[PDB]
Amino acid sequence: ELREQLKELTKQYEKSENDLKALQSVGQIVGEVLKQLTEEKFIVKATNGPRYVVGCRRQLDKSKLKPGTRVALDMTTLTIMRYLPREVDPLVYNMSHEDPGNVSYSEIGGLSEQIRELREVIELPLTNPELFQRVGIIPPKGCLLYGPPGTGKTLLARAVASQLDCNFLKVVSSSIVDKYIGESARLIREMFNYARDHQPCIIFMDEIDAIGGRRFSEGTSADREIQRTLMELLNQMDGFDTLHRVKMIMATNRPDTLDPALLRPGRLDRKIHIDLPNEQARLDILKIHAGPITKHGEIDYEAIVKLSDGFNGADLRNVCTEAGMFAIRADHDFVVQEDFMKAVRKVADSKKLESKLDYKPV
Amino acid sequence: KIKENSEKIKVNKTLPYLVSNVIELLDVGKCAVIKTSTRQTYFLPVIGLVDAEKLKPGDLVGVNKDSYLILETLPTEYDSRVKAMEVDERPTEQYSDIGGLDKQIQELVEAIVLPMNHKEKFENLGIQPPKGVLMYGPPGTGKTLLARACAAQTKATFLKLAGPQLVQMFIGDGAKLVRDAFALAKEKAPSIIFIDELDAIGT
Numbered sequence: 001e002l003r004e005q006l007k008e009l010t011k012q013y014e015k016s017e018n019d020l021k022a023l024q025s026v027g028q029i030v031g032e033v034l035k036q037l038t039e040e041k042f043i044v045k046a047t048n049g050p051r052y053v054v055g056c057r058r059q060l061d062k063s064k065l066k067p068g069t070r071v072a073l074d075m076t077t078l079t080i081m082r083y084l085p086r087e088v089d090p091l092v093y094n095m096s097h098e099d100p101g102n103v104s105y106s107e108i109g110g111l112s113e114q115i116r117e118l119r120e121v122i123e124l125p126l127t128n129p130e131l132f133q134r135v136g137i138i139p140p141k142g143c144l145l146y147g148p149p150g151t152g153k154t155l156l157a158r159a160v161a162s163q164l165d166c167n168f169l170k171v172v173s174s175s176i177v178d179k180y181i182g183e184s185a186r187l188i189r190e191m192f193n194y195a196r197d198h199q200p201c202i203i204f205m206d207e208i209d210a211i212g213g214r215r216f217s218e219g220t221s222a223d224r225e226i227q228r229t230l231m232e233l234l235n236q237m238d239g240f241d242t243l244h245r246v247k248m249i250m251a252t253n254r255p256d257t258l259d260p261a262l263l264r265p266g267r268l269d270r271k272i273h274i275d276l277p278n279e280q281a282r283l284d285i286l287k288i289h290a291g292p293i294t295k296h297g298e299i300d301y302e303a304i305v306k307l308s309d310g311f312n313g314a315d316l317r318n319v320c321t322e323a324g325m326f327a328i329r330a331d332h333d334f335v336v337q338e339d340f341m342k343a344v345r346k347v348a349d350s351k352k353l354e355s356k357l358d359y360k361p362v
Numbered sequence: 363k364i365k366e367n368s369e370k371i372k373v374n375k376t377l378p379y380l381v382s383n384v385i386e387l388l389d390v391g392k393c394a395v396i397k398t399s400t401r402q403t404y405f406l407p408v409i410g411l412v413d414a415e416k417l418k419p420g421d422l423v424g425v426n427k428d429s430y431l432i433l434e435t436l437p438t439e440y441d442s443r444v445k446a447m448e449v450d451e452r453p454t455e456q457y458s459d460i461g462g463l464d465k466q467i468q469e470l471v472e473a474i475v476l477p478m479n480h481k482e483k484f485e486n487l488g489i490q491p492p493k494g495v496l497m498y499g500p501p502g503t504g505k506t507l508l509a510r511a512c513a514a515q516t517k518a519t520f521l522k523l524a525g526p527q528l529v530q531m532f533i534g535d536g537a538k539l540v541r542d543a544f545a546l547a548k549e550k551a552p553s554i555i556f557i558d559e560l561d562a563i564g565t
């Protein structure tokens with residue numbers, strides 16, 4: 001038994017020795033080089049804000065650390081120890097890594113023209129970028145999926161994110177806003193820096209009107225800070241530095257409140273309207289959302305669609321859910337057309353509490 | 363020398379830690395780019411006493427004050443405002459204490475409780491349970507009373523937000539409050555979130 005006993009003890013020995021070696025190491029202050037002075041003096045600013053002139057430990061290949069490069073200054077002498085790659089904020093990391101479920105284009109109904117416009121803007125320019133060169137244009141960069149609530153804008157964005165390969169950055173415009181000074185604009189700058197670093201990229205901003213609202217001439221300090229964020233965003237899209245292979249998608253249901261500079265054709269090139277489902281769109285959505293429901297009758301989807309006038313995709317999904325609710329309440333392990341009719345009338349009654357939904361840009 | 367190695371490790375790992383984040387995890391051998399609550403970004407050539415493959419950008423860690431070496435991984439941050447708005451001492455109001463509300467109860471109870479306990483009905487019928495229940499009512503009736511009864515009779519994680527609690531200055535706040543509330547409800551076992559006086563926030 002001593003063999004295995006001492007083997008495990010030696011494994012724990014290696015672990016503990018590694019732990020002690022780590023324990024005998026101290027951290028280093030990350031800054032960015034500003035300029036090189038005399039081959040041994042570098043003006044470096046620590047991220048905390050102070051600026052110093054510091055030395056450089058020898059094996060650093062001074063050519064590798066140029067103005068703007070992240071470096072690790074020693075915590076005591078502040079001398080450079082190693083150059084680092086550009087930082088990726090934890091926010092931008094999780095933005096890139098959010099899971100858009102596994103939504104497929106087969107889960108979206110009436111949106112066919114809109115789907116192909118979005119794909120025209122996103123996919124083809126990033127896969128065959130020479131057709132547009134031949135025709136003599138620079139393919140559109142920005143999309144505005146605007147429409148009434150629950151018409152499928154976020155579902156379409158999720159489908160695109162799941163079904164395309166290029167890098168994708170998920171973000172709700174209200175989850176960029178921070179109370180610190182300049183933090184939101186800095187976060188947007190880091191978004192676009194990450195996008196440029198990973199050149200084939202898409203940036204989806206859900207409910208953009210959180211940030212991209214109209215600019216107030218009499219707003220508060222908070223409004224002015226959010227407007228600074230908006231203007232940083234506008235400069236990033238169509239400012240001095242051109243954007244290559246980075247596309248923007250922005251979803252909204254109050255496009256009338258967006259800044260005209262944001263709605264400008266140069267920034268949000270193609271504004272596509274995810275309108276309320278028409279007759280055929282309602283039929284398609286109802287089939288999509290009633291496919292998995294165990295129906296045991298003859299379903300006049302046409303009648304359901306006729307009574308579903310003015311509904312949205314979420315309303316039709318709720319029609320299916322309410323038919324199921326009626327089934328359980330009746331203690332039935334299936335659904336029928338009487339249940340579907342009751343559900344659609346219930347949702348129609350619920351729709352009476354809404355307000356204006358036909359909001360358009362410009 | 364396991365004993366003495368652990369002794370030295372404990373001496374270095376004595377409290378108090380400084381809680382920082384793991385904003386970036388670089389490969390060079392793995393290194394950290396932590397940012398500490400003193401608002402100071404420190405690059406750690408050696409991550410420390412916690413496994414490298416257990417840290418992801420943004421998670422909360424404990425760090426040595428001087429060496430700034432990661433020592434522990436700490437739970438997620440929930441504003442003490444989003445923890446203080448969780449129901450611990452459950453209300454006590456049986457549905458029998460409710461008056462002329464029977465259909466309204468039945469409807470709520472269904473949409474909320476049934477997907478929690480009898481999810482098998484939903485799964486076998488191939489349905490997505492109803493998501494949100496909005497209780498409109500004139501200034502009277504039994505909206506908050508029924509919410510109290512549900513929280514008392516549910517035996518789940520109940521989180522009473524109220525409306526004007528989520529409206530704050532310091533732009534970003536309020537949104538952070540909502541995000542933290544929903545994240546806490548998600549991490550906890552099946553949970554309800556009660557928005558009292560929704561029109562304060564949903565205008």
Ligand SMILES: Nc1ncnc2c1ncn2[C@@H]1O[C@H](COP(=O)(O)OP(=O)(O)OP(=O)(O)O)[C@@H](O)[C@H]1O
Nearest residue numbers: 108109110149150151152153154155253313314317
């Ligand atoms: N065209 C559609 N086809 C299928 N399902 C749809 C469609 N439109 C909406 N839905 C359903 O609506 C719910 C998701 O809606 P989604 O988040 O896409 O809405 P939205 O248009 O972005 O609205 P909001 O303005 O409220 O954010 C899901 O139930 C999805 O099935």
Ligand SMILES: Nc1ncnc2c1ncn2[C@@H]1O[C@H](COP(=O)(O)OP(=O)(O)OP(=O)(O)O)[C@@H](O)[C@H]1O
Nearest residue numbers: 459460461462463499500501502503504505506507
């Ligand atoms: N149907 C009812 N049965 C029993 N008590 C009721 C009923 N409706 C109201 N009450 C009484 O009303 C008081 C609390 O009302 P509650 O907080 O539920 O109102 P609400 O619907 O949330 O309205 P609001 O906040 O606009 O005043 C308690 O005394 C409760 O007993």
Ligand SMILES: [Mg+2]
Nearest residue numbers: 153154206251
């Ligand atoms: Mg949406």
Ligand SMILES: [Mg+2]
Nearest residue numbers: 505506558559
């Ligand atoms: Mg109330």
